[PDB]
Amino acid sequence: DVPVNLYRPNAPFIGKVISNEPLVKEGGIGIVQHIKFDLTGGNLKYIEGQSIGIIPPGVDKNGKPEKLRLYSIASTRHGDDVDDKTISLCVRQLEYKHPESGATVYGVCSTYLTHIEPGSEVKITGPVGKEMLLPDDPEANVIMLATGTGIAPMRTYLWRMFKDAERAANPEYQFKGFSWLVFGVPTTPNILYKEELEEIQQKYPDNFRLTYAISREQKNPQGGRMYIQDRVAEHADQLWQLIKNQKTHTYICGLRGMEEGIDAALSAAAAKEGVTWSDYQKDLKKAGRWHVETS
């Protein structure tokens, strides 16, 4: 049922870029682009939470062809236009200062993508992944913890759940549970899809909660910059109480250094009721209700 590897690296699907739009507003840090590709002419199908690979042109320092890089799909299975004809990505241009050099280094595939022009042909593979799938149960509770581009799979869940056109297209999935997104980014201008996320909260106040952790505009109780683990700590009991429901699913996507703080917070909450979080968590993973995707 779940589509996987309809296209592989040795024979990728060649899709055409339809649009490449900026997501970081003025005054924000870095570049993050929402890129939409045309899937017509191929049979690439996918579902929420999956990823696709992108093979950039060129060779590496050793003269070897560039390998694919994975990107979390940012659109629902129907595409942003709900026409089953496209797929979108949320790509940050990777750039860092070279060790003891000061010179900025630019990621190969992400620079290629963020600067790509509409009409360009791109090699796509996939889809891949069965670790971040959304429950078919419309009554489920969905906790979403994300940082930066980790918002990608969350957008696919939230759009399917709350977009008017999606609800009209998915008679089998009329969401009426509770979803809570805790999103961490450095600045307000960096809140990806801010306008749309807030529109959902306004229209579905009883079904969607939105919490931000803005590091350059907020500080935690300790005086440090506000990060996602700080928000989880702040609402640890509320989160634990929700997680206890057998119908609750939790999704974590973003940097590889966020789970540690998250676990510390939930561990203290569960310990109050004589529960060892590490063990409970293991059981949640085994049951397919604790979804993590970081790097």
Ligand X SMILES: NC(=O)c1ccc[n+]([C@@H]2O[C@H](COP(=O)([O-])OP(=O)(O)OC[C@H]3O[C@@H](n4cnc5c(N)ncnc54)[C@H](OP(=O)(O)O)[C@@H]3O)[C@@H](O)[C@H]2O)c1
Ligand Y SMILES: Cc1cc2nc3c(=O)[nH]c(=O)nc-3n(C[C@H](O)[C@H](O)[C@H](O)COP(=O)(O)OP(=O)(O)OC[C@H]3O[C@@H](n4cnc5c(N)ncnc54)[C@H](O)[C@@H]3O)c2cc1C
CB of 284 to ligand Y, least distance (A): 21
Is residue 228 within the footprint of ligand X (CB under 6 A)?
yes
The upper half-sphere exposure of residue 179, i.e. CA atoms within 13 Å in the direction of its Cβ, equals 25
Is residue 72 within the footprint of ligand Y (CB under 6 A)?
yes
∠ at Cα 277 (243, 235), nearest 5°? Answer: 50
14 vs 125: CA distance, rounded Å: 9
- Bridge partners of 185? 214
276 vs 255: CA distance, rounded Å: 25
Q: Which of 20, 72, 86, 125 binds ligand X (CB under 6 A)?
A: 72
Is residue 52 within the footprint of ligand Y (CB under 6 A)?
no
Quick one: 150 or 177, whose CB is closer to ligand Y?
150
* Residue type at 222 in one-letter notation: Q
Q: Which does 109 bind (CB under 5 to 8 A by kind): ligand Y, ligand X, none?
A: ligand Y
Quick one: 17 or 255, whose CB is closer to ligand X?
255
Q: Which does 198 bind (CB under 5 to 8 A by kind): ligand X, ligand Y, none?
A: none
Is residue 249 within the footprint of ligand Y (CB under 6 A)?
no
132 is in an annotated binding site: no
Is residue 16 within the footprint of ligand X (CB under 6 A)?
no
x-or-dash pattern for ligand Y, window 131-150, by CB under 6 A?
------------------x-
Nearest by Cα to 180 from 228, 237, 254, 239: 239
Is residue 107 within the footprint of ligand Y (CB under 6 A)?
yes
Nearest by Cα to 68 from 127, 148, 17: 127
3-state secondary structure of 270: helix
CB of 189 to ligand X, least distance (A): 11
- Residue 156 neighbours by CB under 8 Å, 6+ apart: 48, 49, 73, 74, 75, 76, 134
Nearest by Cα to 232 from 223, 243, 217, 245: 243
Q: Which of 125, 147, 170, 250 binds ligand X (CB under 6 A)?
A: 147
150 vs 16: CA distance, rounded Å: 24
215 is in an annotated binding site: yes
CB of 135 to ligand Y, least distance (A): 20
Is residue 68 within the footprint of ligand Y (CB under 6 A)?
no
Is residue 108 within the footprint of ligand Y (CB under 6 A)?
yes
Residues contributing to the site for ligand Y (CB under 6 A): 51, 69-72, 90-92, 94, 96, 107-111, 149, 152, 293, 295
